[PDB]
């Protein structure tokens, strides 16, 4: 479909086009500043993915349970009957909570891994 | 505690605040040059971590043994009775040796992995 072609498709359809858009995030003092800022934004998103334990991944699973209050919808009405723009709006008030939990979860897992590697 | 809040704490206490400071490494020609240089330094540190086999990790274990001459202290007097600034000063003369060994260790392991994947 091309860049943003899946924007109007359902979440479970648009989830198969992640590489199409990922490849378009990287591809006159004000223009140079714009390029530097675009690089900084890319690196900040990559840093967030790294902190959560998701390095070379576009889809990564975590150990943070869904708390229902964030969204109490069925899977059959999110992935099959909703777009990513609608979902993003629906949980825009909770994105700074979930991310914090994700960071804490990785911090515990990373330390646990170290302890499992210290058993002779 | 916040950014650098653990600077005066022991190594085994400050090791639990790595995400707090990692998130603060990314967050007018001279100012643009300063921003580009900050990005270059970030990428050089990430490249060193990648070469050593540590990608999306803040704590990673290696196969290089401690050679004692670098520091012959007990674990009980490093992690419990020392700060990271004191440790950094103590081994500042050896950081270019350890890193070299780390690169060599990964080079051997990476090749070994390839050979283990060529056995039918």
């Amino acid at each position, epitope marked *: 479909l091309g860049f943003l072609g899946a924007a109007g498709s359902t979440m479970g359809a648009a989830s198969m086009t992640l590489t199409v858009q990922a490849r378009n995030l990287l591809s006159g003092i004000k223009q140079l500043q714009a390029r530097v800022l675009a690089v900084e934004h890319y690196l900040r998103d990559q840093q967030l993915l790294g902190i959560w334990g998701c390095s070379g991944k576009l889809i990564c699973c975590t150990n943070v349970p869904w708390n229902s209050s964030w969204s109490n919808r069925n899977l059959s009405e999110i992935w099959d009957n909703m777009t990513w723009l609608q979902w993003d709006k629906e949980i825009s008030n909770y994105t700074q909570i979930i991310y914090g939990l994700l960071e804490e979860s990785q911090n515990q897992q990373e330390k646990n891994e170290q302890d499992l590697l210290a058993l002779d | 505690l916040g950014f650098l809040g653990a600077a005066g704490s022991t190594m085994g206490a400050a090791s639990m605040t790595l995400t707090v400071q990692a998130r603060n490494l990314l967050s007018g020609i001279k100012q643009l040059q300063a921003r580009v240089l900050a990005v270059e330094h970030y990428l050089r540190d990430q490249q060193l971590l990648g070469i050593w086999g540590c990608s999306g990790k803040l704590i990673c274990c290696t196969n290089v043994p401690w050679n004692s001459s670098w520091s012959n202290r007990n674990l009980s007097e490093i*992690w419990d009775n020392m700060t990271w600034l004191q440790w950094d000063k103590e081994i500042s003369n050896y950081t270019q040796i350890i890193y070299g060994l780390l690169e060599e260790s990964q080079n051997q392991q990476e090749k070994n992995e390839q050979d283990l994947l060529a056995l039918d």
Partner: antibody
Amino acid sequence: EVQLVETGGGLVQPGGSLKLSCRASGYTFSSFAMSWVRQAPGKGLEWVSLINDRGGLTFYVDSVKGRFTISRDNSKNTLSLQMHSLRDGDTAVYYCATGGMSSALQSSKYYFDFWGQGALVTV
Amino acid sequence: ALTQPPSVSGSPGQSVTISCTGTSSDIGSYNYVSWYQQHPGKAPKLMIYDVTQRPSGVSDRFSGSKSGNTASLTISGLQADDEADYYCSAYAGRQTFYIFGGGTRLTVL
């Protein structure tokens, strides 16, 4: 100065359950790994379970792996062990012990250090 | 399980040894062979940790060593008050953590 005092129930019927606990004092609870060891009335000592200092990692002997749960609360300085099914072969004096594991940044243990008074569980 | 003699004895002032044997995958593979003294009616207390190390507060009459796939505890200067069942234990691995032997009854003449 280290005091480990076991509490919990005594005799239960086969198929029941018991929650045992251990109160610790005299040392920093959160700084040491903890474990449970049992001794049948006519036998020697047998290791049953091990929990690390942060409570995140638990290990069991295969004979209890699917039946016993070990947990700790570092703010209450309290351990607990919840046993399900309760088989005839589980009759023993259970002891609370400090040691058996370390956390990579501490020196190695691989031994049990402090032992509690012990409590007898029968089926 | 580890194998120990069921009984050891000697006269006061003499030394005695208590053996502990296993296999090459457990007692022979890791140098973590501890010993405990369990007085009748009491909980076991730590006497030896590591292969050769003693806890602080324990008398220097208790020592030990290992060779091959075996280990032993040596009690020098045996006293009339050393009435206890002695146990050996060792770290086995990341699947099976600790293995204990049977108790050895120490009789002091």
